[PDB]
């Protein structure tokens, strides 16, 4: 089920469920990041994995994030989707995140 | 292979060349009512090719500021063809549905439609304590428009609406969605004019956008009832 | 393929994978299916014998929690000089699971439900006032079905209960506990009813007539004391033997009425109309 | 466990139903997908 | 990079989903922090009138 | 070598022992081992068939004693003109086994513990005052886990308890008794945690986040009487099905806080900082 | 079939949908050093998932007047992650490499990249008798740029550089190239900080050109070391 | 026989000629995490000779008014060698420890060191209600000094501290102590930078004394991690 | 003894575990000591 990754101001209603990506002129650039807090009011809260889990206190197991690209057919592109285990802070450069 | 699909029901066929591996709702296929589940004791009529066939609704204009579209079943078909005449002359109906939704555009258009079939979509109104009236629910063949598609017009969420039987029309991948609905009720048959059991919802999660020549892109809905039974023959309304 | 899952699944060790034609991480959301990418197919895993049971997320256990469904304080006194709008040593309640939103959001995670209702009735007494002690009052909770007549007074002849199921219980006792069967005239309760109750177009939207249980009429069997008491009755429903069908998105906006599914949303995020999750500065902002 | 009533709905909660079929919600498509083959 | 031609829309969109896997497990049930009432659901007192 | 010991060991008779190379009474403490000198090897013993059982020093029996863990008097009255710092017909308690030092020193004889908690709740009522009698009040002890919301008032909507486990009990009843399972997300409770709770360096020292149970919120379900009552609730924990690991030196100095292991010691011996055993005149002084 | 490819090493995966049937260098696959070929007698460390994983380098801007790009292995990875830490703390290394090069553009762009892996690319300078210095060879993660890509900066020819393990990224055919390199030396293990054994070279034989909207097209390099062994543990430099 | 001992781990050996029959903590030997006890599902790295080896800490000066010394594991080793680099780049660790403590003097010196390994030595402060801060606990390679060794700085007793895995260095008997620690936690793996599981404590129960020439007598600590596993690879801090 | 609950942690205290191994605290050394032979 959909994540509200675009939980920002000036994202009104159904615009919150999508992340608009554009052509950039710098390399290795960050697009978005997802706070993995389900207990806190973040992008994972109003999901089927989020709402049912908040009736419970403890949780275990693997999560899968699926990203559907909704550009045109003539849109090409390559993304990297990094998951960083805790212990540090969040990675901000792609050199740091692909580790 | 799984991108081409011909759906033949009755005297109606639909071919499509960008499909997306059609959805059977809850893994279930439509059947007739078996004898161990029947209630109404009279012999049902089963007009097979006369009703189990694709009925094409009026197309809606997919536009820039669109919120969404919804049709309630069998209300969208209660006045079309021989399915509509069997509804008006009988007290009970029982059918599953084969919904095929069509929306194509060029390879320079983008957009994503959530084509979701919602069982018992008991709608709510906005900012009032009054329940939705009869004319707010029973739209017929025209269908309705989502007031707030983000909450599915019932206080729930569009985000979690993928728990229902759904497909997507992503314009870069496919141009059609097909959902095969079984009978979905608490009872075996039902009065079709005061109860809708499936709401077909089509929602722009990603809006239509391109920078090429701005043609009209519509969204067309073809719904085939499947395994129609009708009980309690009387006059028409 | 249906199978009996008592614990969560185990993980198998996996190797370096580099094969043409095989893209397990690529998927098609447009089919309406959830991604079937395994952890073994995305990273190199080890063998993990997983012994984590799944028995607490059973729909039986998820719903067999006793939740409050009704709550009335009503004055137990001499009601000669009282208003007609006031409860006069008794009350009536049309039975529904919509009045309290803890149970309501939980039961609305499903389209159809089939359960037996274990009904627990708790009674509280409190002196209006000087304090002299709490009386051990006897209460009658009578179950009046649909079409049967409800009492209009506390000394009425409807409390005779020749065929209505009454329960007579005291305040000092443990709370009165019965079991209402699966009572619907259909094979499941319609938690949501996309339809109208009557054949005329003035019928109510959103309530199945099959969902109609009846009335719970509770009186104090005692005659009134010389002083007044505020008697609070709390009714607790605990579903059991649950079969549930066709799960739904949870209610995100605050409820407005027990009669319908109308929405307003909160004034700001979270749980507002145009924002369900509270806002951050940008999509690349991490707290 | 203990049930001294003549009605079978009076019994305690039946918490032993460990059957699952998630594929009626997670794989409702007509063609069973493979593990790594493209769809 | 996101590289589109001139007639495609220069801004493209992603929709992110999340599920759990079949090794996922939950325990220790509690009330959900999401729902909350304060006073007066409408027609709730009318179920007693 | 692990073996089943149900009684204490027997003594065998021994003879005059005079053998070169054999010194059973000489030992090496430097190895870190306890002396293995037998009584048969130090004196001449007789045969003693020892029938003294060892079943009362079992860690199960040593820990399965119901001990007090919580205690609150709180006033049951009308709380309109009361301070915000006062308990207003309810209280909250973050559950811990550190508040009372009888159980705390006993549980800190081990590094890791794994037990089920048999929780007994005793309630006492007393009139503030004239005396008119003690009311049979109904209490709700609701178990609020971590991350769930706690009630802020006595008539709050958190007491609806759609999924929280509540227990409704009266003062005149026997004390309310439940069982909390082994609740930790690890395989044992860390009685001592040589570490920090968060990933930032502002986290608390000495408390495992896995050790966090939750909140015990107890209210009086009754509305307030015309007079005031002081209601005291005592919560008793009885560990059961205990597995215990890695025993520790007992706490000798008096505890200072429930949050840590800080020490001051007493002013003089015994149990002072520089003297745990009270002093005698010399090492060759016998009382 | 052979146009899609997922490469899973460690906690890293790379999917690509326009591949070109990846190259195994000289038909060889990376292995660990066998006992009949070993020299250094101490027990090696083999950090398997910690080092055998894709490390993504900094992307380079494919532009109009570009001559080419080169990265020397293992110099490009001597300071990245746990592969870099094992290099700094050991005297000897031995690994093969899985290089995946990414470059996509629209169906209106043209261009051809020669993605060639050169064993022992002993460079030369131009118009001087002085050998290339240390800073002219050891560029690290940044890599270098071909001074004269037509002669491969060593007096040889770009034309005959297809004798080496190579692929092409022709933008009308594919958008990725993958080369699987084995251990390539005269000795079994090697000191990684004073010897590079593979040079990944990416060369514009056909330049980037289109007449559509001029986006930035970069070239991204992901290199996974394979079957890493390290010998001669000491302190770090 | 049991007074001589060579401990060979990795590229590190330690011989000692006055040993005292080394201690295995709770009778347990270090192992790797088995599959029926594992939690983290990714494949761990097991750098065998790179991390399972003796790391020698800084020696402390055994002096006249010494109270004691303590090192917390793995905090004392989180920044040393390849064990430290695996700690900084991973989220989880799991290892046992082989502690060898060295202290020799002449046959005219006396003294007794309680070399005790304390599981979960949750320290306390003196004469305050404030918990010990981060800098009071995480001393790193330097270690700490006992404020009040008689109560073990936690309100317990030094007298009963022989319940823990310990040995003694009595200078007339031996000059070394060796304790072999297994994994000691409630969970299978652990975050090494916010949790210490073993505290090596060295305490002068009998102080150093002689009447010969007053040389410096130090106490040296060599700790070998054993059966190191690391999970959750990321960047370093 | 009497346990009419569906959860096995609800049972009474299990006071029958008479296994001991004191040698993990009293003889934790690697070489098993003799009775009278010197160490």
Automatic annotation (TrEMBL), chain A:
Q: What is this protein called?
A: Genome polyprotein
Subunit note: Interacts with capsid protein VP1 and capsid protein VP3 to form heterotrimeric protomers.
Give the family, as the similarity comment puts it. Answer: Belongs to the picornaviruses polyprotein family.
Q: Its function?
A: Lies on the inner surface of the capsid shell. After binding to the host receptor, the capsid undergoes conformational changes. Capsid protein VP4 is released, Capsid protein VP1 N-terminus is externalized, and together, they shape a pore in the host membrane through which the viral genome is translocated into the host cell cytoplasm.
Its localization reads:
Host cytoplasm; Virion
Automatic annotation (TrEMBL), chains B, G, H:
What gene codes for this chain?
VP2
List the keywords (alphabetical): Capsid protein, Host-virus interaction, Viral attachment to host cell, Virion, Virus entry into host cell
Q: Which residues form a coiled coil?
A: none
Any one Pfam family match given in the protein's UniProt record, by short name: Rhv
Q: What is its main location?
A: host cell
- Localization annotation: Host cell; Virion
An example Gene Ontology CC term for this record: viral capsid
A biological process (GO) of this protein is: virion attachment to host cell
Q: Which GO terms describe its molecular function?
A: structural molecule activity
State the source organism's domain of life.
Viruses
The Picornavirus capsid domain extends over 16-208
Protein name (record) = Genome polyprotein
From TrEMBL, chains C, F:
Protein's name in the database? Genome polyprotein
Quaternary state and interactors: Homohexamer; forms a hexameric ring structure with 6-fold symmetry characteristic of AAA+ ATPases. Interacts (via N-terminus) with host RTN3 (via reticulon domain); this interaction is important for viral replication. Interacts with capsid protein VP3; this interaction may be important for virion morphogenesis.
Taxonomically, the superkingdom here is: Viruses
Annotated function? Protein 3AB: Localizes the viral replication complex to the surface of membranous vesicles. Together with protein 3CD binds the Cis-Active RNA Element (CRE) which is involved in RNA synthesis initiation. Acts as a cofactor to stimulate the activity of 3D polymerase, maybe through a nucleid acid chaperone activity.
Q: Taxonomic classification, please?
A: Viruses, Riboviria, Orthornavirae, Pisuviricota, Pisoniviricetes
Mapped onto the parent protein, the portion here is 565 to 855 of 2188
- The residue range of the signal peptide is none
Subcellular location(s) per record: Host cytoplasmic vesicle membrane; Host nucleus; Virion
Family listed: Belongs to the picornaviruses polyprotein family.
TrEMBL record, chains D, I:
Q: What is this protein called?
A: Genome polyprotein
Could you tell me where this protein is found in the cell? Host cell; Virion
Task: State the organism named in the record.
Answer: Human enterovirus D68 (EV68)
Look up the domain of life of the source.
Viruses
